[PDB]
Amino acid sequence: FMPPREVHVQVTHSMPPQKIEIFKSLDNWAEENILVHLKPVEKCWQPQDFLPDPASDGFDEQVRELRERAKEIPDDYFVVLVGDMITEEALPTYQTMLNTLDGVRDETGASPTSWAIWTRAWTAEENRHGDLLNKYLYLSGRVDMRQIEKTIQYLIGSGMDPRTENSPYLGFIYTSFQERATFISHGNTARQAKEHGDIKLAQICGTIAADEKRHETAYTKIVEKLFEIDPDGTVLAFADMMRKKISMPAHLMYDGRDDNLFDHFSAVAQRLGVYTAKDYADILEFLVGRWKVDKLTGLSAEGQKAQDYVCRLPPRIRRLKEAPTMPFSWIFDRQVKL
Amino acid sequence: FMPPREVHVQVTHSMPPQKIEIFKSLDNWAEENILVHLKPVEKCWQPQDFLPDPASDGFDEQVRELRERAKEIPDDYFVVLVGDMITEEALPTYQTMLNTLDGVRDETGASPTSWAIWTRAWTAEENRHGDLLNKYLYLSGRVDMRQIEKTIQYLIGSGMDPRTENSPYLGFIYTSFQERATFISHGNTARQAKEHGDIKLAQICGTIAADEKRHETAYTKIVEKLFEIDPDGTVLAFADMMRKKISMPAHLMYDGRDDNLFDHFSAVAQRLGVYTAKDYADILEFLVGRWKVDKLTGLSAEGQKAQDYVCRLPPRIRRLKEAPTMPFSWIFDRQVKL
Ligand SMILES: [Fe+3]
Ligand SMILES: [Fe+3]
Ligand SMILES: [Fe+3]
Ligand SMILES: [Fe+3]
Numbered sequence: 001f002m003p004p005r006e007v008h009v010q011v012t013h014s015m016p017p018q019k020i021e022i023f024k025s026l027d028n029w030a031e032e033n034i035l036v037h038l039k040p041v042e043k044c045w046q047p048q049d050f051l052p053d054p055a056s057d058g059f060d061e062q063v064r065e066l067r068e069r070a071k072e073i074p075d076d077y078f079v080v081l082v083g084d085m086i087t088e089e090a091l092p093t094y095q096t097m098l099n100t101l102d103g104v105r106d107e108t109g110a111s112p113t114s115w116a117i118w119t120r121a122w123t124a125e126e127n128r129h130g131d132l133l134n135k136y137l138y139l140s141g142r143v144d145m146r147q148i149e150k151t152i153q154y155l156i157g158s159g160m161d162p163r164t165e166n167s168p169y170l171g172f173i174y175t176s177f178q179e180r181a182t183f184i185s186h187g188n189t190a191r192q193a194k195e196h197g198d199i200k201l202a203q204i205c206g207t208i209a210a211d212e213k214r215h216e217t218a219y220t221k222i223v224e225k226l227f228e229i230d231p232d233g234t235v236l237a238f239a240d241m242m243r244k245k246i247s248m249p250a251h252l253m254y255d256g257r258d259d260n261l262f263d264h265f266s267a268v269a270q271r272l273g274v275y276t277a278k279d280y281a282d283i284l285e286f287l288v289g290r291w292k293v294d295k296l297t298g299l300s301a302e303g304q305k306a307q308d309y310v311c312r313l314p315p316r317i318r319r320l321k322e323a324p325t326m327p328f329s330w331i332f333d334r335q336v337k338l
Numbered sequence: 339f340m341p342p343r344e345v346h347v348q349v350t351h352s353m354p355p356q357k358i359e360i361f362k363s364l365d366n367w368a369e370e371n372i373l374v375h376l377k378p379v380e381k382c383w384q385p386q387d388f389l390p391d392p393a394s395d396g397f398d399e400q401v402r403e404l405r406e407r408a409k410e411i412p413d414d415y416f417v418v419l420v421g422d423m424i425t426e427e428a429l430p431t432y433q434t435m436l437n438t439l440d441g442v443r444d445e446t447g448a449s450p451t452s453w454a455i456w457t458r459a460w461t462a463e464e465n466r467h468g469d470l471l472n473k474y475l476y477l478s479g480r481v482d483m484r485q486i487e488k489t490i491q492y493l494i495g496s497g498m499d500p501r502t503e504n505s506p507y508l509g510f511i512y513t514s515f516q517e518r519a520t521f522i523s524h525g526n527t528a529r530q531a532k533e534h535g536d537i538k539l540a541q542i543c544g545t546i547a548a549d550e551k552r553h554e555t556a557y558t559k560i561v562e563k564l565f566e567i568d569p570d571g572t573v574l575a576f577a578d579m580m581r582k583k584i585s586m587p588a589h590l591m592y593d594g595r596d597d598n599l600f601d602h603f604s605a606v607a608q609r610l611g612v613y614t615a616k617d618y619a620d621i622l623e624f625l626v627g628r629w630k631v632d633k634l635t636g637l638s639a640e641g642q643k644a645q646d647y648v649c650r651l652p653p654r655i656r657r658l659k660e661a662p663t664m665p666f667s668w669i670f671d672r673q674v675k676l
Contacts, residue, residue: 001378001379001380006448010445010446010448010449010450012445012446040339041339041488041491041492041495041594042339042488042594044488044491046483046484046487046488046491047483047487048483048484048487049484051476054476054477054478054479054483055479055480055481055482055483055670059479063401089465091430092429092430092433092461092465093447093458093461095430095433095434096433096434096437096444096447097447099434099437099438100437100444100445100446100447106434106438106497107348107350107438107504108348108350108438108499108500108501108502108503109431109434109435109438109497109498109499109500110344110348110496110497110498110499110590111348111499112348116497120431120494120495120496120497121495123430123431123494123495124490124491124492124493124494124495125491127427127430127490127491127494128487128491131472131487134469134473135472135473135476138389138392138473139392140392141392141393141397142393143393144393145384145385145386145392145393146384146386146387149384149385149386149466149469150379150380150382150384152462152465153379153382153384153462153463153465153466154379154462155462156458156461156462156465157379157458157459157461157462158448158458159444159447159448159454159458160447160448161446161447161448161449162446162447163446164446165446166445252448256379256380332393
């Protein structure tokens with residue numbers, strides 16, 4: 001009963017130590033440009049806002065009506081909603097990821113650096129996503145919570161190597177990509193839930209989507225200023241991640257039964273138009289456009305090669321009855337098209 | 339609306355860098371002595387095991403009977419159960435804590451070192467504690483989930499400085515203490531729930547308690563071998579933590595209303611005999627006895643002073659109608675004795 005493993009050797013500290021100083025000296029900047037784009041707790045939504053109220057006489061009918069709606073949502077949609085939720089639930093791994101980065105990590109757990117304050121407030125926001133989807137899926141009665149819970153324990157145990165090699169350059173680029181990806185994934189589950197006949201579930205997914213957009217804004221902004229100060233180092237970091245290919249956080253997914261769980265869940269998301277191969281390149285092309293890689297002047301020979309590699313990759317990727325039915329343990333081994 | 343803050347200046351890397359090698363060289367050892375005391379996922383309990391089954395025709399009556407039982411559990415007990423749950427839910431902070439430690443941290447997020455494998459599998463086990471207590475409290479209808487969710491977001495945002503200063507010595511001692519403390523806290527909520535007329539809730543708390551015991555075993559075992567190889571360095575680390583005083587993980591607790599939330603929740607736990615000042619010293623005295631500090635030979639002058647300080651502290655601490663009623667937002671501002 002062995003979960004899938006990372007296939008490559010692991011590399012640490014790709015960035016030079018006499019280069020941590022840039023982020024140390026960028027602390028004030030991040031206060032004024034990253035930490036001012038944070039919502040105070042008091043003004044934040046909470047999972048209870050979108051769930052049946054257990055301290056209300058209305059609780060029983062609210063639960064009953066949620067379950068009635070859930071019957072009319074097909075299995076393959078629940079498969080994707082479940083994969084999205086499991087990913088959200090591996091959150092502890094992702095805060096660990098952000099705290100492996102050399103010049104921008106929380107060194108105590110309560111560090112008063114602008115980088116540490118951001119990391120903690122971002123985590124705290126992400127925690128509500130899992131909580132809300134978890135209790136929604138629980139109440140629904142449509143899915144196998146034990147096998148989901150088992151998948152999650154495997155996932156946190158396995159963790160994940162995003163190949164950011166302790167570099168804020170690689171790591172902040174990696175977060176920029178992932179934030180956009182979930183914003184899209186969640187955005188698309190919200191759009192579909194409207195017509196599927198269920199406004200309350202559309203609210204849940206879209207409220208999560210709006211959070212990811214704020215996270216995206218802040219991470220791409222950090223890399224924006226990284227290109228301003230260090231065009232040579234940042235363009236090389238960009239290419240590096242694309243050369244290696246962006247590996248998704250939940251790719252070591254395992255439920256104790258299927259050896260290709262992520263690939264199988266991804267294909268269902270692909271077929272339903274939740275997150276596609278086309279999406280992947282659309283993010284690449286948006287990020288190449290957002291950081292204006294084509295207009296970067298005075299680079300190295302090593303930097304100009306990197307520049308050309310990232311600029312030409314988005315059209316290259318885009319140039320790339322059939323699928324069978326397969327059982328999923330998340331839905332008691334009922335089957336969906338892959 | 340400002341949460342409480344850490345009152346001291348933060349210190350990093352108290353341990354010498356030419357001393358990371360000890361833990362690097364201890365990797366095989368931890369495999370054979372720490373990682374063999376880990377339960378495989380397949381054999382682990384999951385929160386669904388102790389909760390109403392939403393895919394069963396019995397779901398409605400199971401939920402109804404849980405809520406009927408919950409009416410007969412008094413408010414002050416729910417206050418403590420809620421504080422215990424919020425602490426469990428700040429989990430991401432605690433994995434960050436373990437990954438700030440110099441020679442034993444996960445540097446990628448999927449590192450194949452024995453230290454990183456342990457950290458990930460421990461986190462994965464801890465994640466079920468929050469999930470289970472969260473859904474139990476939700477279904478109960480006795481508590482204010484929005485204000486609890488708000489307290490949690492404040493908590494992760496604030497994080498926590500355990501003052502372990504990136505040292506595995508200080509950090510592993512700090513975990514040894516905390517594991518014992520929760521094992522007791524959860525153990526006592528389980529004992530009481532029996533007579534309170536509710537076996538299912540007693541099962542929940544005790545199953546969590548059994549996990550903490552396994553965690554305790556492993557952490558005290560690491561410090562056991564630390565005293566064997568480095569009596570001088572470890573006794574100094576022990577005292578250091580006690581001199582500073584063990585600060586609890588959820589001590590910056592804040593709900594947007596009470597400025598002394600942790601102190602107020604602690605007092606209710608104290609009055610009910612869940613976790614007391616007496617407990618605190620009983621852990622100290624167990625740990626002084628467990629690591630056999632009295633029998634440590636050939637220490638430094640600086641080491642002999644440390645030895646005497648830790649050995650004499652447990653009796654010293656033990657030598658230390660009245661309380662008012664106070665509202666708690668966790669229970670819709672209903673009041674309990676403090
Ligand atoms: Fe999210
Ligand atoms: Fe996000
Ligand atoms: Fe726990
Ligand atoms: Fe524990």
